[PDB]
């Protein structure tokens, strides 16, 4: 594809955790490095909309692009710097919440079925916060 924000959004929607998926999209982004500003902006917006279990993969793409871009120029390293603090903060919180979801679901089952009383369920809930 030619570079466009629509093409990048579609490619990001399909980004998976495979080595090949990350590598392929990284190569395309480097081939269109003149558009590093828009690329990074779209990347950042789509990260935030992504399902919690796909968020780390966005940071892997960043890793790939930033590392592989060094031999071409400092554009991506510089562009990403403006958004990476927010990205890491966001993924840290989300991956935490995401990894606790099965535990919350279990407590919700326990409450629905009165496996224990509400006061004890609340104590368990608090112990994960």
């Amino acid at each position: 594809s030619s570079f466009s924000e629509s093409a990048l959004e579609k490619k990001l929607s399909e980004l998976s955790n495979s080595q090949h998926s990350v590598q392929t999209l990284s190569l395309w982004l480097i081939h269109h490095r003149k558009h590093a500003g828009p690329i990074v902006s779209v990347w950042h917006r789509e990260l935030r909309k992504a399902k919690s279990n796909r968020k780390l993969t966005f940071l892997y793409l960043a890793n790939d692009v930033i590392q592989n871009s060094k031999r071409k120029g400092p554009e991506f390293t510089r562009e990403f710097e403006s958004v990476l603090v927010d990205a890491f903060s966001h993924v840290a919180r989300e991956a935490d919440e995401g990894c606790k979801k099965p535990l919350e679901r279990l407590l919700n089952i326990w409450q629905e079925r009165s496996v224990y009383g509400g006061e004890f369920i609340q104590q368990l809930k608090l112990s994960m916060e």
């Binding site: 955790n17 080595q19 892997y60 890793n63 790939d64 031999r71």
Partner: peptide, 12 residues
């Protein structure tokens, strides 16, 4: 396939 590894780029 292999899952992505972030040490895979050759940048040192």
């Amino acid at each position: 396939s292999p899952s992505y590894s972030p040490t895979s780029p050759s940048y040192s």
